[PDB]
């Protein structure tokens, strides 16, 4: 239940999303990540941005300590925040994430976003920065060579941003993945074909339609999990709309994340491996595509490097 990455490492095809908004107590992250591992998740997705790396790292170390899993059975991802794009800041930012989680290495480190922000400890300084992401990428390469990250990749990059890295003079390591918003309303078919042509894995976030956080998501936007085609497919397969949306991705060759802080829904989500969709089903889902990205905020849209500009 793994995909082989372009550097020889393996990535579990279903990942646990760990972001929760700051009104959720930090202690929840520890509890739900343990539940995710007990359920059968082996891919755990975190980031400096999420302010949960201590808890998530502790959940992983607990499950190693109690004997359920070994470190090498867990694929752990963190991400370089956008205030740390300057090359000399990359490795220290990774080392801080590692110290927070109390781990020797991350399976995957990503550039969280191509939209550089003014350097500082403040996450949302209130202001943009201009940085050659090719130099950021060089510093990511050195973190791989150092054994700080097994694999390195990008997140929120469009085709052109991804091409910039791929065409870089003296490239040593291709991004193994690009983790992007991806679900039946914004299925990224063209970007997905581009990544397949390069042996780069596309990892889908907001695959269940996002947490609909009012800071970036319009509450008027359609609720993906109430979609009538999804609901009709869930009735046909006697599963749930969430399960259909996750299975859709696996059948497209997409690595899919699923966040849930709910005990029942965490266990429910690993049922994605227990059924499959037919071609007529996949076509019905493909027909939902309507260029809708839930994250739709002035914070992003006015950035010189906004990925949805193309
Ligand atoms: N690279 C980036 O910039 C980026 C951006 C967004 C997300 N991500 C990563 O991707 C992860 C997932 O994306 P996301 O946070 O946008 O959320 P998501 O996976 O789209 O989930 C949205 C909501 O779906 C609900 N849910 C989960 N399972 C369900 C089920 N079986 N039935 C009904 N509802 C279900 C969850 O609510 P409950 O908790 O109540 O179950 C969750 O809040 C994030 O946690 C983060 O790790 C990365
Ligand atoms: C478009 C963009 C740019 C930088 C970071 C993110 N990611 C997040 C933004 C707010 C809250 C959570 C996340 C996430 O990474 O889960 C996105 C969606």
UniProtKB/Swiss-Prot annotation:
Q: Where is this site: Important for substrate specificity?
A: 49
What tissues is it present in? Expressed in many tissues including adrenal gland, brain, kidney, liver, lung, mammary gland, placenta, small intestine, colon, spleen, prostate and testis. High expression in prostate and mammary gland. In the prostate, higher levels in epithelial cells than in stromal cells. In the brain, expressed in medulla, spinal cord, frontotemporal lobes, thalamus, subthalamic nuclei and amygdala. Weaker expression in the hippocampus, substantia nigra and caudate.
| Site description Lowers pKa of active site Tyr, residues in chain | 79
| Protein name in UniProt | Aldo-keto reductase family 1 member C3
EC number(s) reported in the record? 1.1.1.-, 1.1.1.210, 1.1.1.53, 1.1.1.62
Outcome of mutating residue 215 to P, per the record?
Decreases in the retinaldehyde reductase activity. 3-fold decrease in the kcat value, whereas the KM value does not vary
- Any one Pfam family here would be Aldo_ket_red
